[PDB]
Design a protein around this ligand. Structure first.
Ligand code: HEM
Ligand SMILES: *[C@@H]1O[C@H](CO)[C@@H](O[C@@H]2O[C@H](CO)[C@@H](O)[C@H](O)[C@H]2NC(C)=O)[C@H](O)[C@H]1NC(C)=O
Ligand SMILES: *[C@@H]1O[C@H](CO)[C@@H](O)[C@H](O)[C@H]1NC(C)=O
Ligand SMILES: *[C@@H]1O[C@H](CO)[C@@H](O)[C@H](O)[C@H]1NC(C)=O
Ligand SMILES: Nc1ccc(C(=O)n2ccnc2)cc1
Ligand SMILES: [Ca+2]
Length: 595
């Protein structure tokens, strides 16, 4: 009831009534409420935020302050006692490729980003949080538990800064704190093009009217494009090897270079766009740059939606797919297309799917070079291994023929992430992605596990044995009740991820509910969904149905043997076929001649 229209937004945004393209910012999608789904607004609250003080202070902020009559355990302790494991044998997913992991991260990055508010120019509390571990305002450091190895080697904390929040971006008053989504809620390739007109154009090739995306001129991949460098300094991709002096790449999403396989997939995504703007030229040489760009962008956005919705989600959601995501019925303007705050946690299930190492594979899909396989941690913010060691193709082969990690209740998150995560301002390959996830739940005012079980029409355990029966695991359940002392207090990230996988999928009931709703809402709520009548011609929509990730690979690399189904486990040379066995993206229906 308070501040019904609050915010310090992207202000002067008006709308074209019959514009055939999405805005960059995702604005003007919904007509009755054109800011719905747009970047740089609040994340949607499916449930009222729960803060220590009901307003903004995170649970665990204040010693003496309990949640339902109990102290919440330290995030790094939940990490250590529950999330970690030593043995990487037996952890691989026998029927999911490493690409399965990778698409997840892509899709996710297109949907949401809640950037930390550090927001200082020449600032003392930057290094002050890291150095001295002094909690305060936006500094909310992850403290070590007693007898934690990182005490011996790193200090007293890992640093952590609270997420951005709307309206008063510096202080706060009388409505609960709400974190920002810096990207568009729609599945619109915002990670290739940007979610700011400012970025969107700094990414374009405006030097020649072919509507191409700007490429790299310093370096090449057998005459294939690289994303341009991001010439901002301090660059972390330079920080990881000062000798190579190779910076991070520049993409529509800022996180592209966090790891080499993410960078890799961003590169396939750039080329597909350029490849598409070239073909449109040949068939429509009368069209200008802008339209070529837009029609390419339009084509790529559909491509991501099909792949995600036809190929990705059925094998994440499995049995719960149809329940939550009925086949398409058309655009409904009453659907909230906004990504919700809990989804930015639910989708972090992908964290448990990341394995310990990355391989590079030659044309016989054999260990490319002597150091073919590398540990994941040496590949954070590492572009130098792409430009100075083989291109994209060997890695794109790694994605096809190696396996995602399997989630496992006794082996959750690998140490490459749980202990050896590199973050940009800091220095050591020494952080804990699991600790962070949990600190973030609290920072974001997340309701606890039972609220969400409640929300999803599932039983709400109150006892050890109850939890045992739901998790189908005595020991896990025990360690959790020992830490959290009531399921009501269990952080949703751990809680949802602890539940056994549903038949034919890769998440448990609760997550499939959360994920399920969200994806349903983003498709049903999108005036520009590829299948929404009048978005494409029926002719255009029949060429669209035949895209594949395999074909994306074939059209954009020099790989000539691919699986038919890229997300399932594929073994070479058995499950591999020559590229010409594979449907293409016919673009005949896009030719629009003068008469
Ligand atoms: C090796 C691969 C990955 C690395 C190195 C990585 C790292 C990170 C980091 C550092 C964050 C920020 C956490 C925070 O500040 O609170 C994050 C957030 C996140 N991760 Fe990952 N991640 C990886 C893979 C994935 C995958 C495969 C998925 C999904 C399947 C995923 C889903 C998410 C989501 C949804 C967020 C929150 C984004 C937001 O809304 O701000 N991540 N990841
Ligand atoms: C930094 O990157 C450089 C490449 O620019 C790596 O140096 C190369 O190492 C391999 C291993 O034998 C050689 O094939 C090259 O001849 C080396 N080049 C140069 C210029 O030294 C180096 O290993 C990287 N170091 C780190 C710590 O990442
Ligand atoms: C823009 O396109 C022209 C014409 O194809 C090309 O020569 C040039 O390298 C491009 N510039 C950038 C920055 O991508
Ligand atoms: C792999 O994944 C899907 C998901 O159930 C399924 O259609 C297929 O049977 C599985 N393949 C194998 C070899 O188990
Ligand atoms: N799911 C991701 C979260 C964060 C990052 C990341 O830490 N940065 C840092 C700079 N750019 C991305 C990457 C992926
Ligand atoms: Ca988006």
């Amino acid at each position: 009831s308070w501040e019904v229209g609050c915010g310090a937004p992207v202000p002067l945004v008006t709308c074209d009534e019959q514009s055939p393209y999405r805005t960059i910012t995702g604005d003007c999608n919904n007509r009755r409420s054109p800011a719905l789904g747009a970047a740089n607004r609040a994340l949607a609250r499916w449930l009222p935020a729960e803060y220590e003080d009901g307003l903004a202070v995170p649970f665990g902020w204040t010693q003496r302050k309990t949640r339902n009559g109990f102290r919440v355990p330290l995030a790094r302790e939940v990490s250590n006692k529950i999330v970690g494991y030593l043995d990487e044998e037996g952890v691989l997913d026998q029927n999911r490729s490493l690409l399965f992991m990778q698409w997840g991260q892509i899709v996710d990055h297109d949907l949401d980003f809640a950037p930390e508010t550090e927001l200082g120019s020449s600032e003392h509390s930057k290094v002050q949080c890291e150095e001295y571990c002094v909690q305060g305002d936006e500094c909310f450091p992850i403290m070590f538990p007693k007898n934690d190895p990182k005490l011996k080697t790193q200090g007293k904390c890992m640093p952590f800064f609270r997420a951005g929040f709307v309206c008063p971006t510096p202080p706060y008053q009388s409505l609960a704190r709400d974190q920002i989504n810096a990207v568009t809620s729609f599945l619109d390739a915002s990670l290739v093009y940007g979610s700011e007109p400012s970025l969107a154009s700094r990414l374009r090739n405006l030097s020649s009217p072919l509507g191409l995306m700007a490429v790299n001129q310093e370096a090449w991949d057998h005459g294939l494009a690289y994303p341009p460098f991001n010439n901002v300094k301090p660059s972390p991709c330079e920080f990881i090897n000062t000798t190579a002096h190779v910076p991070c790449f520049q993409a529509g999403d800022s996180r592209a270079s966090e790891q080499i396989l993410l960078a890799t997939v961003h590169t396939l995504l750039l080329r597909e766009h350029n490849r598409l703007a070239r073909e449109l030229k040949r068939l429509n040489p009368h069209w200008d740059g802008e339209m070529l760009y837009q029609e390419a962008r339009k084509i790529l956005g559909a491509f991501i939606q099909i792949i995600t919705f036809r190929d990705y989600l059925p094998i994440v959601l499995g049995s719960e797919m149809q329940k939550w995501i009925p086949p398409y019925q058309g655009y409904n303007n009453s659907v909230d297309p906004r990504i919700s705050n809990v989804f930015t946690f639910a989708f972090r299930f992908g964290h448990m799917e990341v394995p310990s190492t990355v391989s590079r594979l030659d044309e016989n899909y054999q260990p490319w070079g002597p150091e073919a396989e590398l540990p994941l941690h040496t590949l954070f913010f590492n572009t130098w291994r792409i430009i100075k060691d083989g291109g994209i193709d060997p890695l794109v082969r790694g994605l096809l023929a190696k396996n995602s990690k399997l989630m496992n209740q006794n082996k959750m998150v690998t140490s490459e992430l749980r202990n050896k995560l590199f973050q940009p301002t800091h220095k050591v390959h020494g952080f804990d992605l699991a600790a962070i996830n949990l600190q973030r739940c609290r920072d974001h005012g997340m309701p606890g596990y039972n609220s969400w079980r409640g929300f999803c029409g599932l039983s709400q355990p109150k006892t050890l044995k109850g939890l045992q029966a739901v998790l189908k695991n005595k020991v896990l359940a025990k360690k959790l009740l020992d830490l959290y002392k009531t399921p009501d207090n269990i952080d949703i990230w751990i809680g949802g991820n602890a539940e056994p996988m549903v038949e034919r999928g890769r998440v448990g009931p609760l997550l499939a509910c959360l994920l399920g709703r969200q994806f349903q809402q983003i498709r049903d709520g999108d005036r520009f969904w590829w299948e929404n009548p009048g978005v494409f011609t029926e002719k255009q929509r029949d060429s669209l149905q035949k895209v594949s990730f395999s074909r994306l690979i074939c059209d954009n690399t020099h790989i000539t043997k691919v699986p038919l189904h890229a997300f399932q486990a594929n073994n070479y040379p058995h499950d591999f076929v020559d590229c010409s066995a594979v449907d293409k993206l016919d673009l005949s229906p896009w030719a629009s001649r003068e008469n």
